[PDB]
Scaffold this active site. Sequence first.
Site, PDB file in Angstrom:
ATOM      1  N   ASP A  35      -7.598  17.129   3.377  1.00  0.00           N
ATOM      2  CA  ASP A  35      -7.007  16.221   2.259  1.00  0.00           C
ATOM      3  C   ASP A  35      -6.040  17.218   1.383  1.00  0.00           C
ATOM      4  O   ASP A  35      -6.144  18.469   1.170  1.00  0.00           O
ATOM      5  CB  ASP A  35      -8.303  16.056   0.709  1.00  0.00           C
ATOM      6  CG  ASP A  35      -7.462  15.644  -0.385  1.00  0.00           C
ATOM      7  OD1 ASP A  35      -6.462  14.944   0.253  1.00  0.00           O
ATOM      8  OD2 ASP A  35      -7.182  15.611  -0.965  1.00  0.00           O
ATOM      9  N   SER A 199      12.849  13.814   0.141  1.00  0.00           N
ATOM     10  CA  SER A 199      12.951  12.839   1.310  1.00  0.00           C
ATOM     11  C   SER A 199      14.582  12.767   1.197  1.00  0.00           C
ATOM     12  O   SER A 199      15.204  12.615  -0.200  1.00  0.00           O
ATOM     13  CB  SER A 199      12.177  11.503   0.744  1.00  0.00           C
ATOM     14  OG  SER A 199      13.000  11.042   2.006  1.00  0.00           O
TER      15      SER A 199
HETATM   16  C1  LIG Z   1      -7.695  18.763  -8.253  1.00  0.00           C
HETATM   17  C2  LIG Z   1      -6.324  19.299  -8.337  1.00  0.00           C
HETATM   18  C3  LIG Z   1      -6.247  21.033  -7.788  1.00  0.00           C
HETATM   19  C4  LIG Z   1      -5.844  17.899  -6.784  1.00  0.00           C
HETATM   20  C5  LIG Z   1      -6.123  16.706  -6.991  1.00  0.00           C
HETATM   21  N1  LIG Z   1      -5.398  15.947  -6.076  1.00  0.00           N
HETATM   22  C6  LIG Z   1      -5.009  14.342  -5.664  1.00  0.00           C
HETATM   23  O1  LIG Z   1      -6.361  13.853  -6.740  1.00  0.00           O
HETATM   24  C7  LIG Z   1      -5.072  13.802  -4.565  1.00  0.00           C
HETATM   25  C8  LIG Z   1      -5.798  13.780  -3.668  1.00  0.00           C
HETATM   26  O2  LIG Z   1      -5.370  13.363  -2.111  1.00  0.00           O
HETATM   27  C9  LIG Z   1      -7.345  13.091  -3.785  1.00  0.00           C
HETATM   28  C10 LIG Z   1      -8.074  13.258  -2.713  1.00  0.00           C
HETATM   29  C11 LIG Z   1      -9.091  11.920  -2.636  1.00  0.00           C
HETATM   30  C12 LIG Z   1     -10.017  12.160  -3.324  1.00  0.00           C
HETATM   31  C13 LIG Z   1     -10.589  10.518  -3.637  1.00  0.00           C
HETATM   32  C14 LIG Z   1     -12.229  10.432  -1.865  1.00  0.00           C
HETATM   33  C15 LIG Z   1     -11.177  10.874  -1.171  1.00  0.00           C
HETATM   34  C16 LIG Z   1      -9.291  12.409  -1.532  1.00  0.00           C
HETATM   35  N2  LIG Z   1      -6.256  11.261  -3.086  1.00  0.00           N
HETATM   36  C17 LIG Z   1      -6.484  10.319  -4.378  1.00  0.00           C
HETATM   37  O3  LIG Z   1      -7.445  10.356  -5.836  1.00  0.00           O
HETATM   38  C18 LIG Z   1      -6.215   9.067  -4.564  1.00  0.00           C
HETATM   39  C19 LIG Z   1      -6.474   8.090  -3.952  1.00  0.00           C
HETATM   40  C20 LIG Z   1      -6.972   7.936  -2.018  1.00  0.00           C
HETATM   41  O4  LIG Z   1      -5.507   6.880  -2.310  1.00  0.00           O
HETATM   42  C21 LIG Z   1      -8.368   6.470  -2.250  1.00  0.00           C
HETATM   43  C22 LIG Z   1      -8.768   6.439  -0.689  1.00  0.00           C
HETATM   44  C23 LIG Z   1     -10.488   6.404  -0.975  1.00  0.00           C
HETATM   45  C24 LIG Z   1     -10.053   5.253  -0.810  1.00  0.00           C
HETATM   46  C25 LIG Z   1     -11.199   4.307  -0.508  1.00  0.00           C
HETATM   47  C26 LIG Z   1     -12.346   4.551   0.105  1.00  0.00           C
HETATM   48  C27 LIG Z   1     -12.057   6.361   0.366  1.00  0.00           C
HETATM   49  C28 LIG Z   1     -11.189   7.203   0.390  1.00  0.00           C
HETATM   50  N3  LIG Z   1      -7.634   5.123  -1.821  1.00  0.00           N
HETATM   51  C29 LIG Z   1      -7.213   4.084  -2.195  1.00  0.00           C
HETATM   52  O5  LIG Z   1      -7.933   4.125  -3.563  1.00  0.00           O
HETATM   53  O6  LIG Z   1      -6.309   2.922  -1.823  1.00  0.00           O
HETATM   54  C30 LIG Z   1      -6.138   1.269  -2.245  1.00  0.00           C
HETATM   55  C31 LIG Z   1      -6.158   1.451  -4.201  1.00  0.00           C
HETATM   56  C32 LIG Z   1      -5.134   0.758  -1.639  1.00  0.00           C
HETATM   57  C33 LIG Z   1      -7.644   1.111  -2.415  1.00  0.00           C
HETATM   58  C34 LIG Z   1      -5.035  16.033  -8.650  1.00  0.00           C
HETATM   59  O7  LIG Z   1      -3.889  16.063  -8.681  1.00  0.00           O
HETATM   60  O8  LIG Z   1      -6.069  15.568  -9.736  1.00  0.00           O
END
Ligand SMILES: CC(C)C[C@H](NC(=O)C[C@H](O)[C@H](CC1CCCCC1)NC(=O)CC[C@H](O)[C@H](Cc1ccccc1)NC(=O)OC(C)(C)C)C(=O)O
EC number: 3.4.23.22
Length: 330
Positions: A35, A199
């Site tokens: 991630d 970008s």
């Molecule tokens: C804690 C911080 C310091 C950093 C933190 N960063 C983020 O949250 C971004 C980070 O890249 C997080 C990391 C992911 C969290 C959820 C589990 C997988 C890792 N991204 C996220 O939180 C973004 C969530 C993803 O986009 C999901 C991924 C997914 C979907 C289904 C099944 C499995 C996995 N896609 C997803 O929901 O796609 C659909 C709506 C089309 C179905 C924040 O800003 O809160």
Amino acid sequence: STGSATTTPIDSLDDAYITPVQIGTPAQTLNLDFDTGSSDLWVFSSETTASEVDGQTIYTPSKSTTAKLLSGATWSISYGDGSSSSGDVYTDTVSVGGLTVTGQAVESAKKVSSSFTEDSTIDGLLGLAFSTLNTVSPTQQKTFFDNAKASLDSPVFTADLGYHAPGTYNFGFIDTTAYTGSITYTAVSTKQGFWEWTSTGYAVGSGTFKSTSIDGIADTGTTLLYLPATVVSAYWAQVSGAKSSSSVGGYVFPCSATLPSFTFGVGSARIVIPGDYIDFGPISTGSSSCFGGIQSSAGIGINIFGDVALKAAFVVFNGATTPTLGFASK
Ligand SMILES: CC(C)C[C@H](NC(=O)C[C@H](O)[C@H](CC1CCCCC1)NC(=O)CC[C@H](O)[C@H](Cc1ccccc1)NC(=O)OC(C)(C)C)C(=O)O
């Protein structure tokens, strides 16, 4: 040293990608989501409340001879999707793709939220943003990349994500056979802790490229490509059955359309997203409406180059003391 590891999508929509990682001595092998948008390596463990554990593989620190409790330290993380976990911390040996670091902080979950319980394919996360975003207290812990750079033959890793197909993470070298033409690097700002970059513009299908600055982050951990509202409305105005649907939360379109490509600029270079990549899939099995892969970031507050866009390119995370991002077509 280097490491190389295969990464695979967890499902037939490429929702997310898992890569095996070996923790502990002897190795326990867990399949983690690498991630670039967070900075914690956390896993399901023998600590985790049992009715929050489903079919995942657990880390058992009592089974590893090189694990040590990091006394005093705790962690608590919530992510952009709402989901969250917390617990305590050990240091242990962790290897990816051949490359081993000793004394990596492995954050052991006591509790995980619902969405993690429900997804059997993912046994935790390995964060590769900058270590200022690590959630461990009172002293934050380095990511696996930061602990590895002393020994890496070069302080980089690559992401080579596949479309409905496996790909590669490499550490410490760039594989010149995995891309075509040359890589263009652009500056990264680490002021918010992400691999954030700007970008130089966009084109839709075969029309004009519009020079406009889009500040966003390259995030292997987000599935879709999230861009400002007016650039996203400009793309879907070219797809005749597309509309924005409040029910499903996004632009949908008839699964039979041929979508145009989407181009993003990197300095003076262009990365083209093929349109089939942006067809995310059907909103339910059987349905004749599909989910678009480009959606508005207005609701999240920051633009996100997620795996839709990254799996169209070979991507270099240059973690030198001034970091850059490299893009090449592949
Ligand atoms: C804690 C911080 C310091 C950093 C933190 N960063 C983020 O949250 C971004 C980070 O890249 C997080 C990391 C992911 C969290 C959820 C589990 C997988 C890792 N991204 C996220 O939180 C973004 C969530 C993803 O986009 C999901 C991924 C997914 C979907 C289904 C099944 C499995 C996995 N896609 C997803 O929901 O796609 C659909 C709506 C089309 C179905 C924040 O800003 O809160």
